[PDB]
C-alpha cells in the first residue's frame, strides 16, 4: 500500500545526504553554544512562553522531516534525563565525527570501519583524559564547597540570576545532596520538584524540604499554622485514598426517599457518617487531612470546630511523595488509620507569598528526606520560568560533580588535551584505523574552534596557540576564553567540568555517530 509519494534512498546517494542533513541542524546550534551565544524565543504548544539558549529545549521543539536529524532528538531525549546540559556539546561533536566520516568515505573506507574506528578512538581518549584528570575531595575539602558554588555560577551567569546567584548557588547544592546518598551517588530528577509562581522577586525564593500541594487550607477560618502540640512526635497528617462522603454499596447505588420522614433520617445519617469519619482522624491524632477528592460544605464545618485543616484534590503521584518524605504510609480505608501510618513532618504552616492570592502551604522536615520542592518567585512569568530552568541547569551540573569527585578543566582545554593525545598515538597505530584515529583528533578540534568563533577570536589561531602552550611549555589545561577575563589559563580561574559529564558526552556522540552510519536507507511512506 501507499506506493505513491514513497521516498527511497541507496548507498551511493544517502551517504552524502545523511551528512548534509546533520550539518543543517548543527550550524543552527553553533550560534547558541557558549555563554556568548543567542537566547532563542520558544513557545510550547501548551502556551508556555520562555527565552533560553538550552539545547535540550530548542531541539525538543524542532519538528522536521529529516530522518538523520530525528536521531539527534532521540539521543537528546535520553541525555536530557542523564544530564540535559550537554545537548549542544554532543550534537556538534557528533556532527564533527560525521564530517570526518564523509572524508573517510571518499578515501574508500567503509562506514562500518568508521564506526569501529571512532569506537577504539573514543576508548583511547578516555584513558588519556583520566591520566590528566584531577580530583576534588582528595585534594581540598573547602574548595569542594567553592567548586559547587562557582560551577553553578557559570551556568547562572548568562541569566538575570547573576545578581542574586549567591543564594541560588547554595540552593542548588543542598537540593541535590538531600535526594541522594554519598556512597550511592544516585540523583533522580523526579525527586527534586521544580515549581514557581508569579509575584515577588528571585531573592525571596525559598528551598523547601517537602511537598507543596498548592492548598489554601480549604475554609479560611481554619488556622494557617500547625503546632507540634506540646512535644508530640513530628506533625501527623492523614492520607486517604477514598473520598469523604457516606459510603454507598456497589450493588445498588440507588437511594429512595418516600417522604420527609426518610428524608430527615437520611440527612442525619449522612451527618452521622461525617462524625464517624472525623473521629478516626482524632483517634489517630492527625492534625491535617489530605484527600484525593473534594469536600462538602458540611465537611469544612466539622473540621473547623475541631481545628483540623483540610486538603482537597491531591493527585495520585503527589500522595506518594508525601508518605516518603514524612515517613508515612498509604492507608486504603478510613478505619485503618493509626499513629504509625501517619506521615510525620517537622511543621505545617501557610506562608503568604507577596501579593499572590494562591497562599500555598509549606511542609518541611528536619531530617533528610527523599523529596525536595524548589520554589522560585519572580515579578514576571517569563522571569520565573527563566530562573527555574536556570536553577535546574545548576542542579544538573552539581549532580555530575558529586557523582564523580574527579573533574576536568573546561573552557576548551579538555577537547585540546584529548585531541593532542590521540593524534600522537594515531601514528603509533598502523593500518586502516590510523586515519580513523587522526580524523577523530581533528573532529575534537571542532569544539574549541566553535567556541572561539562565538567568543570573537580566531578559531585556527587560538587552537594552534593552545596546542603550543600545552606542549613546548608544559602539560596543563588552557582553554579558549568563553567569558571576559584578562588572560588565558582557565585553570587559574578554577573552571571545572565533571569527568563523568564529559565522558557521558563523548560516549553518546560516538554511539549515535555509529548508529547514523548503520542506516544507509531511508523509507518514508506518503499520506493516504
Amino acid at each position: 500500500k501507499d506506493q505513491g509519494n514513497k521516498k527511497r534512498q541507496h548507498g551511493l546517494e544517502a551517504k552524502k545526504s545523511h551528512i548534509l542533513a546533520a550539518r543543517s541542524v548543527a550550524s543552527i546550534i553553533k550560534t547558541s553554544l557558549g555563554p556568548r551565544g543567542l537566547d532563542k524565543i520558544l513557545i510550547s504548544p501548551d502556551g508556555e512562553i520562555t527565552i533560553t539558549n538550552d539545547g535540550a529545549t530548542i531541539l525538543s521543539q524542532m519538528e522536521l522531516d529529516n530522518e538523520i536529524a530525528k536521531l539527534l532528538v532521540q539521543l537528546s531525549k535520553s541525555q536530557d534525563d542523564e544530564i540535559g546540559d550537554g545537548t549542544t556539546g554532543v550534537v556538534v561533536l557528533a556532527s564533527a565525527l560525521l564530517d570526518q566520516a564523509l572524508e573517510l568515505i571518499q578515501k574508500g573506507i567503509h562506514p562500518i570501519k568508521i564506526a569501529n574506528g571512532f569506537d577504539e578512538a573514543a576508548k583511547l581518549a578516555i584513558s588519556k583524559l583520566e591520566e590528566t584528570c584531577d580530583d576534588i575531595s582528595a585534594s581540598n575539602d573547602e574548595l569542594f564547597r567553592d567548586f559547587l558554588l562557582r560551577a553553578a555560577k557559570t551556568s547562572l551567569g548568562s541569566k538575570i540570576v547573576s545578581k542574586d546567584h549567591d543564594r541560588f548557588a547554595e540552593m542548588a547544592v543542598e537540593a541535590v545532596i538531600n535526594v541522594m546518598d554519598k556512597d550511592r551517588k544516585d540523583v533522580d530528577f523526579d525527586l527534586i520538584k521544580m515549581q514557581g509562581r508569579v509575584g515577588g522577586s528571585i531573592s525571596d525564593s525559598k528551598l523547601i524540604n517537602g511537598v507543596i500541594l498548592d492548598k489554601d487550607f480549604s475554609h479560611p477560618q481554619m488556622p494557617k499554622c500547625v503546632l507540634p502540640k506540646e512535644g508530640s512526635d513530628g506533625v501527623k497528617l492523614a492520607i486517604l485514598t477514598c473520598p469523604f462522603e457516606p459510603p454507598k454499596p456497589k450493588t445498588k447505588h440507588k437511594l429512595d426517599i418516600s417522604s420527609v420522614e426518610e428524608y430527615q433520617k437520611l440527612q442525619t445519617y449522612e451527618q452521622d457518617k461525617f462524625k464517624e469519619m472525623i473521629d478516626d482522624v482524632k483517634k489517630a491524632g492527625a492534625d491535617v487531612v489530605i484527600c484525593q477528592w473534594g469536600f462538602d460544605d458540611e465537611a469544612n464545618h466539622l473540621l473547623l470546630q475541631n481545628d483540623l485543616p483540610a486538603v482537597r484534590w491531591v493527585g495520585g503521584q503527589e500522595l506518594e511523595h508525601i508518605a516518603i518524605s514524612t515517613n508515612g504510609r498509604i492507608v486504603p480505608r478510613f478505619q485503618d488509620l493509626s499513629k504509625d501510618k501517619l506521615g510525620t513532618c517537622s511543621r505545617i504552616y501557610e506562608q503568604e507569598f507577596g501579593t499572590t492570592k494562591d497562599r500555598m502551604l509549606i511542609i518541611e522536615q528536619s531530617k533528610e528526606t527523599k523529596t525536595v520542592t524548589c520554589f522560585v518567585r519572580g515579578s514576571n512569568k517569563m522571569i520565573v520560568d527563566e530562573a527555574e530552568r536556570a536553577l535546574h541547569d545548576s542542579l544538573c551540573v552539581v549532580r555530575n560533580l558529586v557523582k564523580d569527585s574527579r573533574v576536568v578543566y573546561g573552557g576548551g582545554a579538555a577537547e585540546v588535551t584529548m585531541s593532542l593525545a590521540v593524534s600522537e598515538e594515531a601514528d603509533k597505530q598502523r593500518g586502516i584505523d590510523q586515519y580513523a584515529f587522526r580524523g577523530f583528533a581533528q573532529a575534537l578540534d571542532t569544539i574549541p574552534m566553535t567556541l572561539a568563533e562565538n567568543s570573537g577570536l580566531d578559531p585556527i589561531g587560538t587552537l594552534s596557540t593552545l596546542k603550543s602552550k600545552q606542549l613546548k611549555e608544559k602539560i596543563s589545561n588552557i582553554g579558549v576564553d568563553c567569558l571576559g577575563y584578562g588572560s588565558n589559563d582557565m585553570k587559574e580561574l578554577f573552571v571545572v567540568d565533571p569527568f563523568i559529564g564529559k565522558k557521558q558526552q563523548i560516549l553518546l556522540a560516538t554511539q549515535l555517530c555509529r548508529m547514523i552510519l548503520k542506516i544507509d536507507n531511508v523509507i518514508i511512506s506518503g499520506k493516504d
Binding site: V25, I28, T31, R36, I41, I43, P45, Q61, M62, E63, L64, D65, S455, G456, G484
Partner: protein, 195 residues
C-alpha cells in the same frame, strides 16, 4: 521542514536583515512622529470606514499587525518602557533603530563580534549616564523650603496607617532617611529592625 505550525527559523542572512532593516521599518513608523512637530500616520482596516489618524507611538505600533518575528521583540520592549513611564515610547524605538542601523555597518564593513558591540555600548552607555549626571539640574532650588515640604508630604502618607498616632516623630524619621543619604534612594541603603 523544521519547526512548523506557523513557527519557522529565518535564514542567517535574512535574520540579520529582519533584526536590523526589519526593525528599522518598524521604527520608521514612529520615526517621523517623534517630537511635538512630528508628522501623523494613517491606520486603515479592511472595512476602510473605521480608520483613524493619530501621532501616538504606542497606538500605531500595537494596532498594525506585525508579521516580522523580530518586530514582536520591539513590542515587548515598548511594554517595558510603558511600565516605567507612559511617555517616551516613541523615542526608545527610534533610538533603538538608530543603534541597529549603525550595527549593519558594525558587521559588514567592520567585522566586530556582536557581543563586543553590546559590551561596547555598556561602556558607552555608562559614560552617557555619567555625562547626564554632571549636566543634571533640578527645580529643587530653595531646598530650605523643599526640605520643609518633605516632612508635610510624609505626614499625608501616614494617613489611614497605624503610624498616624504621632505624625511629627515618624515624618522626621522618613525625611531624614532620604536627604541624609546624598545618593541612591533605594531601600537597599535603609535597614529595618523590628523589635
Amino acid at each position: 521542514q523544521i519547526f512548523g505550525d506557523q513557527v519557522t527559523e529565518e535564514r542567517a542572512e535574512n535574520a540579520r536583515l529582519s533584526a536590523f532593516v526589519g526593525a528599522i521599518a518598524v521604527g520608521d513608523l514612529v520615526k517621523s512622529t517623534l517630537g511635538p512637530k512630528g508628522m501623523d500616520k494613517l491606520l486603515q482596516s479592511a472595512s476602510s470606514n473605521t480608520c483613524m489618524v493619530t501621532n501616538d507611538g504606542a497606538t500605531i505600533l500595537k494596532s498594525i499587525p506585525l508579521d516580522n518575528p523580530a518586530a514582536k521583540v520591539l513590542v515587548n520592549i515598548s511594554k517595558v518602557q510603558d511600565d516605567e513611564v507612559g511617555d517616551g515610547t516613541t523615542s526608545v524605538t527610534v533610538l533603538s533603530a538608530e543603534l541597529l542601523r549603525e550595527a549593519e555597518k558594525l558587521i559588514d564593513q567592520s567585522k566586530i563580534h556582536p557581543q563586543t558591540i553590546i559590551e561596547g555600548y555598556r561602556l558607552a552607555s555608562a559614560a552617557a549616564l555619567d555625562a547626564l549626571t554632571k549636566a543634571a539640574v533640578d527645580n529643587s532650588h530653595d531646598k530650605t523650603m523643599f526640605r520643609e515640604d518633605l516632612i508635610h508630604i510624609a505626614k499625608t502618607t501616614l494617613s489611614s496607617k497605624i503610624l498616624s498616632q504621632d505624625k511629627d516623630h515618624f515624618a522626621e524619621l522618613a525625611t531624614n532617611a532620604i536627604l541624609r543619604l546624598k545618593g541612591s534612594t533605594n531601600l537597599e541603603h535603609i535597614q529595618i529592625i523590628k523589635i
